[PDB]
C-alpha cells in the first residue's frame, strides 16, 4: 500500500512540475525568434529557459535540499539535458513526430533540430526515445517521479556523497514501484518500472551523444557565441 509519506512525495512532485512547466508556453515569445544554424539562437534560448525550470523543479524534490551545494550542482549539470528531453515529451506529438508548443512558429521538427546543428546521430535516437516514452502513456504522477529519479542519480560524474544521493533516490524509486502496483492498472502496468528504468539508460546514451555534439559545435567560437551564458556554464565549464 502507498504510505502517507509516499503520497505526500507525489503531491509535492506534481505541484513542483506545475509551478515549473507552463503548458501555455507564453514565455517563448521572449526568446530570439525562430528562423527557417538558423534555429540555434531560438533553440539555445529554449534550452536555457528549460534549464532554469529544471533547476526550479529540482529544488522542490524531497531530500534534495539535504545535499551539499556541490552535489546539487553536479547533479543538475549532468542531468539537465536529460530532464529537458524527458519533460519535453509533454510537448511532443505522435501525429507530426514533432514537438508542439501551441503555435506553428513554436512547433519543432527534425529539420529544425538539424538547423540547430544536430546530426541524425543525436536526433534519430532522440525521436525513438520520444516515441517509446509516449507509448508508455505514463500517469502524470509517474512522469514527475521519473524526472526526480533521473536528477538524483548516485553514479553521476563528480558526486561527493553517493550514499546520501542513493538514499534520496531509493525513497523516490520505492514510491514509484509502489505507485504503479497500487494505482496503475494492468495491462499498462506490466513491466512498467523496468521499462521506465530502461528509459533512464536511453537518456544516458542521449546525454553522452549530446556532449559530443556540443563539443563539435563548441569548438567553433562563432557558434558558441550564439549560446546563452547558462548553457555555456552547464555544458561548458
Amino acid at each position: 500500500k502507498l504510505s502517507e509519506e509516499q503520497q505526500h512525495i507525489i503531491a509535492i512532485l506534481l505541484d513542483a512540475h506545475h509551478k515549473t512547466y507552463d503548458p501555455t508556453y507564453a514565455d517563448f515569445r521572449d526568446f530570439r525568434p525562430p528562423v527557417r544554424l538558423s534555429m540555434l539562437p531560438h533553440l539555445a534560448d529554449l534550452v536555457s529557459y528549460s534549464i532554469q525550470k529544471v533547476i526550479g523543479f529540482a529544488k522542490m524534490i524531497p531530500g534534495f535540499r539535504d545535499l551539499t551545494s556541490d552535489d546539487q550542482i553536479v547533479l543538475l549539470k549532468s542531468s539537465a539535458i536529460e530532464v529537458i528531453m524527458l519533460r519535453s515529451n509533454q510537448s511532443f506529438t505522435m501525429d507530426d513526430m514533432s514537438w508542439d508548443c501551441g503555435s506553428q512558429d513554436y512547433k519543432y521538427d527534425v529539420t529544425d533540430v538539424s538547423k540547430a546543428g544536430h546530426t541524425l546521430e543525436l536526433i534519430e535516437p532522440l525521436i525513438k526515445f520520444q516515441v517509446g516514452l509516449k507509448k508508455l502513456n505514463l500517469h502524470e504522477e509517474e512522469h514527475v517521479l521519473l524526472m526526480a529519479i533521473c536528477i538524483v542519480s548516485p553514479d553521476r560524474p563528480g558526486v561527493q556523497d553517493a550514499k546520501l544521493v542513493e538514499a534520496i533516490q531509493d525513497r523516490l524509486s520505492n514510491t514509484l514501484q509502489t505507485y504503479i502496483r497500487c494505482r496503475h492498472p494492468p495491462p499498462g502496468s506490466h513491466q512498467l518500472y523496468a521499462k521506465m528504468i530502461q528509459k533512464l539508460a536511453d537518456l544516458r546514451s542521449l546525454n553522452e551523444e549530446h556532449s559530443k555534439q556540443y563539443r563539435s559545435l563548441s569548438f567553433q567560437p562563432e557558434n558558441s557565441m550564439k549560446l546563452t551564458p547558462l548553457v555555456l556554464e552547464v555544458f561548458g565549464n
Binding site: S69, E233, N237
Partner: peptide, 11 residues
C-alpha cells in the same frame, strides 16, 4: 566550483 549561475539559481 566554477558554476556561479547554477549555484545562484539553486540557492
Amino acid at each position: 566550483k566554477n558554476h556561479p549561475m547554477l549555484m545562484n539559481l539553486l540557492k
